[PDB]
Amino acid sequence: THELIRNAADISIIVIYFVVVMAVGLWAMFRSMVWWPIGASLFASNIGSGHFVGLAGTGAASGIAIGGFEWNALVLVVVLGWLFVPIYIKAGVVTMPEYLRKRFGGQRIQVYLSLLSLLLYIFTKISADIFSGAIFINLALGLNLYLAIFLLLAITALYTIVIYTDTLQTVIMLVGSLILTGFAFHEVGGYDAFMEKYMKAIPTIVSDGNTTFQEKCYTPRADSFHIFRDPLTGDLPWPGFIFGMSILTLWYWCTDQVIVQRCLSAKNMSHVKGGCILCGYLKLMPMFIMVMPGMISRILYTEKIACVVPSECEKYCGTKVGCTNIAYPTLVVELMPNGLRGLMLSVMLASLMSSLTSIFNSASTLFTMDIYAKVRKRASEKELMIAGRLFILVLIGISIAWVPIVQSAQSGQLFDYIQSITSYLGPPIAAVFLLAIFWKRVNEPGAFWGLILGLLIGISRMITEFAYGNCPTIICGVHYLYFAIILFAISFITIVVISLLTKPIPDVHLYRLCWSLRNSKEERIDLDAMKMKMTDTSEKPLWRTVLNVNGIILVTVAVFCHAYFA
Amino acid sequence: LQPWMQGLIAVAVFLVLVAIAFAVNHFW
Ligand SMILES: OC[C@H]1O[C@@H](O)[C@H](O)[C@@H](O)[C@@H]1F
Q1: How far away is chain A from the Cα of B27, in angstroms, using its nearest Cα?
Q2: What is the CATH number of the domain that holds A206?
Q3: Angle A439-A441-A443 (CA atoms, 0-180°, nearest 5)?
Q4: What residues 376-405 of chain A have any CB closer than 8 A to a CB of chain B?
Q5: Hey, is the C-beta of A552 within 8 angstroms of any chain B C-beta?
Q6: What is the CA radius of gyration of chain B?
Q7: Cys staple from A275: which of A39, A69, A129, A194, with CB 3.0 to 4.6 Å?
Q8: Does residue A564 belong to the interface with chain B, where contact is any CB pair within 8 Å?
Q9: How many domains does chain A contain in total?
């Protein structure tokens, strides 16, 4: 399986792709980004190889429900265009912790939230993406997982040396993924035959010595073709699904620095909205092109993807957890002709490079403006950039060192790992941002202490899970999309209360920083020609109405797809 | 209830939702 791509013709495609990417990057190197590149880059930053691998694996093991996550992004993307980005533009902010500094004041909350978003990036993004790329390389090539990570990040470092490049990335990835989807669906015999054959993927080897595994452990779920699964016994329960995934997605899109940073570089508000719409329409695809291909991989490679014997799973992937995360790679490697196999390897690398370069740049911005600038108040621009570069290097090192914990991570389902860790560490951030933008009363001490409590609970559960890998069901037995809701509610209530206890932060410090005061001019007094254009969110009535209708139609399409897939 | 019945019903209810949202936006 690993020797398939060794053909010279197949690798010709990857070298052509890399030459094209280098040419585009050099041309770009050698605020008017516009709607189609804004949306293309948002999609390419959101959809990395982490999504490919995790979504396909969770689709193989659990079914279509995981794909629904991506569709929720659609709705949240709409929010990002019409609720949060206008405020980030009016506030004239570059980073989100800088927005919280302007909103609340004081240095502790900015530093803390920057560090928390950096830890979130490290674990979820900079481990899942590199791990997924390593899976792709290891299944495609004999190189080990760690060596695969090393090669992948070397290639990414070459790649960085953005929105236009990410537009190329997303176009190539979308075309290649559509090609693979069509090819695999025809091979299985269409969607009807795919559904019929999917409820038969039971591996032949199901007993190890005298121990027989439970029937529900290895057979595909009866609800594998339903997004809304049982609230209690079904993995990814529908109430947890909707609410917890909406909270997590709110964090990721409307408060993470990467998405908002790429959304801010728009020429004007209309192109912000257009980029949001294009990214949403592109995000409507990742189900049909990542989840269903993984299910097809299960159908065609049941013994490899549905393994339940620890010995067999270990021999197939070196892990005794189930080999669930290698769904998409196998499909790409074993079912793709030489040229198309090379093209799909290029697609996976394209999505990964977009996501990882976006995250590297955003983390550099966060550490550069929100911590290093504060430690060295008189830092020169050159030293500032040097600090950012060293920070991304340290971030990469920490993420690589953290990879091994991601391997098992809830039975090898990488996307489950991503969503669980980010559910532990994101709901506090989402709560503070929602309250800050929508609630004037919140103040710096209250927000800081609410965040500290939320992080305390999240780290408590995370350490318990990592220690137990018999864990008490009263704490860890609840699915993490429900721990996300619990943590969000706890942080929300804590922030509200302790803010009502301490200080109002008068009212003249919240002009153009809160939703109620987004339009007031009133000579804002900060807690800490060109600018008039930068803080301008005016849009021509024609384009504004066109983009409003476009967003309504996009969310209509998202709801239609959700209901079509139950 | 075929899947496209569900899709159309969801489109209808969500369109009503957006219509109510814009109605309140105009009124509020
Ligand atoms: O970590 C949360 C994020 O995970 C990504 O994989 C999904 O595409 C996003 O919708 C979500 F917000």
Answers
A1: 17
A2: 1.20.1730.10
A3: 105
A4: none
A5: yes
A6: 12
A7: A39
A8: yes
A9: 1
